[PDB]
Design a protein around this ligand. Structure first.
Ligand SMILES: [Mg+2]
Ligand SMILES: [Mg+2]
Ligand SMILES: [Mg+2]
Ligand SMILES: [Mg+2]
Ligand SMILES: [Zn+2]
Ligand SMILES: [Zn+2]
Lengths: 71, 155, 99, 40, 38, 42, 108, 177, 162, 43
């Protein structure tokens, strides 16, 4: 279990991390599912372009925001 | 449903005025206050200020000791920005969860860059033969709050 | 050693002292602690417990206003959940966003 | 406490995380010169 | 008397009565049927 | 019947004394609540 | 005409909310104490220490009071006065008196 | 707000004399608040190493109410220290002998266990009925709210409220009562 | 409510029935369709031992219970009412309904201890000398579990043991 | 005067300690989170 979690980069608690929703990974997640909290990412403004890289924030509802704090 | 000790919920019932009446009453109260501010009839302000990871209760002429180093030449005059609360004898202004910069301003001065006195951090084990002694010194910075200034504008 | 473990304890101690103070003044207004704190939060007012307790000692006025606020919001919450409809937002029940 | 309600509104669990509280540069020079940025 | 975990009416005239937070079996016809729940 | 000022004390005497201190302070304008002093460069 | 708490005491209290909505405000004037709720100042002064015959003898009669008790009994009365136990009222030892901070710090 | 220093501080830490009526109240729910007020935990200035604790006078002590059968099964024990000198006493008996005891033990057992308990035990005044030295009457500041709402017997209710409450069932006339 | 009357006259004895007026059930029940006298008045899981105005409606002048078949209560509410009646009594409420005995008011005993929410009889209970530590406790019973279905405004289930 | 034989939590005889309403809550809370988890892991 420990090493699943190690190779998930889930080392440090209460920290979000991102992963492919493919099955290869779901093997692992299925092994540890009681140790974790999974929630779907959501992209309301859509995906970050390069200009939006320094402005991108992640809200606890599981949502990504591209433009953070205009002027 | 007669009156039984249960059938009646044991707590005073609630009435909140209609939102239009309250909207009027509010605009009113705010205005009155804004007139106290336009007048400058407030004697002495305090403000609850978020700074450097902490919250402090600040009034003019005073002193706080910040636990970390800030890079400013000694003596520089500095506008603290994040302000949670403001207050005066008659009345009080509350940020959700902050005040508009234009609504208030607080200018403080850095007084003394310094190093903290030695603190002693000692870990120890029973008969495992492990002592570790460390002496730590922390850079510290003392600011004097100079002025709390409140501008007229509120709606 | 005891000095160090104490250094870590000291912060607990302070927080408890604080909380009890807050509690006390809250009581003076006929309001228990937890109700006060949460219903103060729900108004988007982040205040430390430190600064809270000092608002209860050195600022009885300001403080009484705070407890009134939270009281207002609480009853507004009782009516919010008892009303069972989406239309009313209490004037203080509204959730502002940053600009 | 109060993590729950904070969550349902969509704020951070902790008032320290990602709120405008932490984000803004809490001091300036009085002249208006924008302060040197913060390590956090 | 007797003290018992289990009462039973040992006859027709036996009856069942709760006194002093206990169960009793009292019998007029025979004294010997007297029982006391423990 | 208006209340001008009030004060605390160890005896009724010293109380009158201090409520008087207060009254005097509000009269003259020397009061904690007073605007803290100006420092500015005109 | 609504406040959550009675205006009986401290301040009359006005909560309001800015039409913007990003600011709460409070108007709290002090509520002073009603002349109805007051009772007259106690005035008691009576001098019978004056003997009609000689008044220097009589004005030396208010300086004529003083007394001596034992440690135990005095301590009892002392502790019945200020509502403390008999313990506070015993001396402290040499070592303990030695170490009381000679020049203690002062705020304000 | 503006006070001189000596008076200001004297005001902040000023002791208070509180009164609390015990007629028909659980000794527990009484001692709860009694203890609060004794430790000084109602005062926001409170601190442990600070002497603050407020006097408390409870009156009508004999008139305690005990929920459940507690009168019967709560026993108070103590020991002389002599062999076979051990004493178990029904609450009912104890209170019979000394009205004050019951409440005093509640409050005592309810404080922190350090020394100051002994001292705050001093500021606690306990009266079987309402008989109070006009000394202690004179200095009373304020009255505390009765911690339980006492149920009225049948005979308290106004006929207005007796009639106001609806007859639930209609009895048969033939039946005798 | 039929009073039975007896007359002793000149070595002859008259025993006869006489009917008094039975008050009638109030006009308008909230759940007219409802069955049991409690349940049509919306009173279920509401009345406690603290309601006299409800309770005194079923009992006898000398304080005992009514027969259920006469009151016709759902067996459950019958037992509930029973317990609450005993409780209210022990609670020294309904002082009216104690049986009248001209000699017995005179012989003072210590003023009756004020108690409430008392499930047992005061004579039966044995004093528990042994308490017991935190892992085996002897719980002093309060209220009756029959009432465990009364609605809790607190959401905290009523505490039956301490 | 009521004692526990041997060691508190260890042997064939143990200090009895009961489940708390609190405990019921915590457990349900975790179960909730994991029901949601094994949902998001489905598709
Ligand atoms: Mg790690
Ligand atoms: Mg740390
Ligand atoms: Mg052992
Ligand atoms: Mg074992
Ligand atoms: Zn038999
Ligand atoms: Zn029914």
């Amino acid at each position: 279990e420990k090493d699943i979690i190690k190779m998930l980069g889930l080392e440090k608690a209460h920290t979000p991390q991102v992963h492919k929703n493919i099955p290869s990974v779901n093997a692992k997640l299925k092994v540890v599912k009681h140790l974790i909290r999974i929630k779907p990412l959501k992209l309301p403004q859509g995906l970050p372009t390069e200009e939006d890289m320094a402005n991108t924030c992640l809200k606890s509802n599981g949502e990504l925001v591209v433009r953070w704090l205009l002027n | 449903v007669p009156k039984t000790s249960l059938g009646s919920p044991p707590w005073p019932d609630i009435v909140l005025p209609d939102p239009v009446e309250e909207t009027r009453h509010h605009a009113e109260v705010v205005g009155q206050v804004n007139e106290l501010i336009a007048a400058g009839r407030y004697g002495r302000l305090f403000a609850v200020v978020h700074f450097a990871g902490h919250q402090w209760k600040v009034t003019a002429e005073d002193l706080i000791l910040i636990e970390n180093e800030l890079d400013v030449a000694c003596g520089e005059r500095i506008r603290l920005e994040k302000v949670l609360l403001v207050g005066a004898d008659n009345f009080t202004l509350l940020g959700k969860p902050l005040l508009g910069k234009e609504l208030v301003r607080v200018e403080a001065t850095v007084i003394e860059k310094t190093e903290s006195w030695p603190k002693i951090n000692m870990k120890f084990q029973k008969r495992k033969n492990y002592q570790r002694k460390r002496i730590t010194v922390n850079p510290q910075t003392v600011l004097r709050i100079n002025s709390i200034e409140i501008a007229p504008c509120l709606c | 050693v005891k000095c160090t473990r104490a250094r870590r304890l000291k912060k607990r101690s302070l927080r408890t002292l604080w909380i009890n103070r807050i509690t006390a003044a809250s009581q003076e207004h006929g309001l228990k602690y937890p109700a006060f704190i949460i219903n103060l939060i729900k108004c988007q007012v982040e205040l430390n417990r430190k600064v809270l307790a000092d608002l209860a000692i050195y600022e009885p006025k300001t403080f009484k206003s705070l407890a009134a606020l939270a009281k207002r919001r609480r009853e507004e919450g009782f009516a919010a959940a008892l009303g069972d409809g989406k239309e009313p937002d209490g004037i203080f029940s509204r959730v502002v966003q940053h600009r | 406490a109060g993590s729950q309600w904070r969550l349902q509104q969509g704020f951070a669990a902790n008032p320290s995380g990602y709120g405008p509280l932490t984000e803004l540069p809490d001091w300036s020079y009085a002249d208006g010169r924008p302060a040197p940025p913060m390590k956090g | 008397f007797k003290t018992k975990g289990v009462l039973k009416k040992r006859c027709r005239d036996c009856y069942l009565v709760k006194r002093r937070g206990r169960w009793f079996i009292y019998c007029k016809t025979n004294p010997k049927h007297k029982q006391r729940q423990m | 019947r208006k209340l001008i000022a009030e004060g605390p004390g160890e005896t009724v005497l010293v109380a009158e004394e201090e409520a008087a201190r207060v009254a005097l302070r509000k009269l003259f304008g020397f009061t904690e609540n007073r605007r803290p002093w100006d420092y500015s460069k005109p | 005409t609504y406040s959550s708490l009675p205006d009986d005491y401290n301040c009359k209290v006005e909560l309001a909310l800015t039409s913007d909505g990003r600011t709460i405000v409070c108007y709290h004037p002090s509520v002073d104490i009603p002349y109805e709720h007051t009772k007259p100042i106690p005035x008691x002064x009576x001098x019978x220490x004056x003997x009609x015959x000689x008044x220097x003898x009589x004005x030396x009669x208010x300086x004529x009071x003083x007394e001596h008790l034992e440690q135990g009994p005095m301590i009892e009365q002392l502790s019945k006065m200020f509502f403390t136990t008999k313990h506070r009222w015993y001396p402290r030892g040499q070592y303990h008196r030695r170490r009381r901070k000679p020049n203690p710090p002062k705020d304000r | 707000s503006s006070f001189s220093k000596a008076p200001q501080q004297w005001a902040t830490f000023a002791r208070v004399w509180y009164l609390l009526d015990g007629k028909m109240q659980p000794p527990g729910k009484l001692a709860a608040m009694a203890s609060v007020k004794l430790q000084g935990l109602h005062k926001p200035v409170y601190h442990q190493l600070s002497d603050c604790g407020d006097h408390v006078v409870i009156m009508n002590t004999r008139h305690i109410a005990f929920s459940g059968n507690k009168w019967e099964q709560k026993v108070y024990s103590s020991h002389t220290g002599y062999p076979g000198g051990f004493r178990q006493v029904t609450a009912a008996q104890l209170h019979q002998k000394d009205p004050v005891a019951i409440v005093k033990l509640a409050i005592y057992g309810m404080l922190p266990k350090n020394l100051h308990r002994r001292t705050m035990m001093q500021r606690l005044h306990l009266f079987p009925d309402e008989d109070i030295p006009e000394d202690i009457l004179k200095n009373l500041v304020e009255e505390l709210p009765q911690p339980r709402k006492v149920p009225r017997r049948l005979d308290e209710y106004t006929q207005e409220e007796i009639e106001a409450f609806p007859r639930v069932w209609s009895p048969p006339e033939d039946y005798r009562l | 409510f039929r009073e039975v009357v007896e007359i002793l006259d000149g070595k002859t004895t008259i025993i006869e029935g006489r009917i008094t007026e039975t008050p009638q059930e109030s006009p308008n029940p909230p759940n007219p369709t409802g069955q049991c006298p409690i349940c049509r008045w919306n009173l279920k899981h509401k009345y406690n031992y603290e309601d006299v105005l409800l309770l005194s409606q079923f009992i006898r002048p000398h304080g005992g219970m009514l027969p259920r078949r006469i009151t016709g209560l759902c067996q459950e509410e019958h037992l509930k009412i029973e317990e609450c009646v005993k409780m209210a009594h022990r609670a020294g409420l309904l002082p009216n309904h104690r049986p009248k005995l001209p000699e017995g008011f005179v012989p003072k005993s210590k003023p009756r201890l004020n108690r409430y929410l008392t499930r047992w009889s005061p004579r039966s209970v044995k004093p528990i000398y042994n308490k017991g530590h935190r892992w085996n406790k002897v719980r002093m019973p309060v209220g009756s579990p029959l009432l465990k279905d009364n609605v809790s405004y607190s959401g905290r289930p009523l505490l039956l043991y301490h | 005067r009521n004692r526990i034989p041997g060691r508190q939590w260890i042997g064939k005889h143990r200090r009895p300690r009961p489940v708390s309403a609190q405990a019921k809550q915590n457990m349900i809370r975790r179960l909730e989170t994991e029901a949601e988890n094994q949902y998001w892991l489905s598709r």
